[PDB]
Amino acid sequence: AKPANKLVIVTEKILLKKIAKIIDESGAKGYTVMNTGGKGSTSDIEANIKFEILTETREMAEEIADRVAVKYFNDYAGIIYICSAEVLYGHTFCGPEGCSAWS
Amino acid sequence: AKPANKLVIVTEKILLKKIAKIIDESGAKGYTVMNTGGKGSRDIEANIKFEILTETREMAEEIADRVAVKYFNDYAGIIYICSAEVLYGHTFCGPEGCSA
Amino acid sequence: AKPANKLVIVTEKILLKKIAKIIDESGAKGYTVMNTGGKGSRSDIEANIKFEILTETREMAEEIADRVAVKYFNDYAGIIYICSAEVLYGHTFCGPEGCS
Ligand SMILES: Nc1ncnc2c1ncn2[C@@H]1O[C@@H]2COP(=O)(O)O[C@H]3[C@@H](O)[C@H](n4cnc5c(N)ncnc54)O[C@@H]3COP(=O)(O)O[C@H]2[C@H]1O
Ligand SMILES: Nc1ncnc2c1ncn2[C@@H]1O[C@@H]2COP(=O)(O)O[C@H]3[C@@H](O)[C@H](n4cnc5c(N)ncnc54)O[C@@H]3COP(=O)(O)O[C@H]2[C@H]1O
CA nearest to A11, candidates A23, A1, A3: A23
CB atoms within 10 A of CB A70: 10
Q: Where are the alpha helices (DSSP H) in chain A?
A: 16-25, 58-72, 91-94
Whether chain B has a CB inside 8 Å of the CB on A5: the answer is: no
Burial tier of A49 (Cβ tally within 10 Å: 0-12, 13-18, 19+): buried
Q: Can you tell me which atom of ligand 1 is nearest the CA of B41?
A: 34
Whether A10 sits inside 8 A of B32 (CB atoms) is yes
Separation between Cα atoms, residue A64 and residue A55, nearest integer Å:
10
Residue B62 CB-half CA count within 13 A: 13
Whether C10 sits inside 8 A of A24 (CB atoms) is no
Residues 6+ apart with CB under 8 A from B45: B37, B38, B39
Which ligand has the nearest atom to the CA of B68? 1
Report the alpha-carbon angle A90-C6-B43, nearest 5. Answer: 90
Q: Can you tell me which atom of ligand 1 is nearest the CA of C28?
A: 29
Which experimental method was this entry solved with?
X-ray
What amino acid is encoded at C64 in this protein?
I
Pick from B85, B87, B91 the residue to mutate for testing the A interface (most A CBs within 10 Å).
Answer: B87
Beta-ladder partners of A47: A37
Residues of B numbered 37-96 whose beta carbons fall under 8 angstroms of chain A's beta carbons: which are they?
53, 82-92
Residue nearest to atom 17 of ligand 1 (CA): C92
Of the candidates A20, A24, A54, which has its C-beta nearest C79's C-beta?
Answer: A54
Separation between Cα atoms, residue B65 and residue B63, nearest integer Å:
5
Closest residue of chain C to B35, computed from CA coordinates: C34
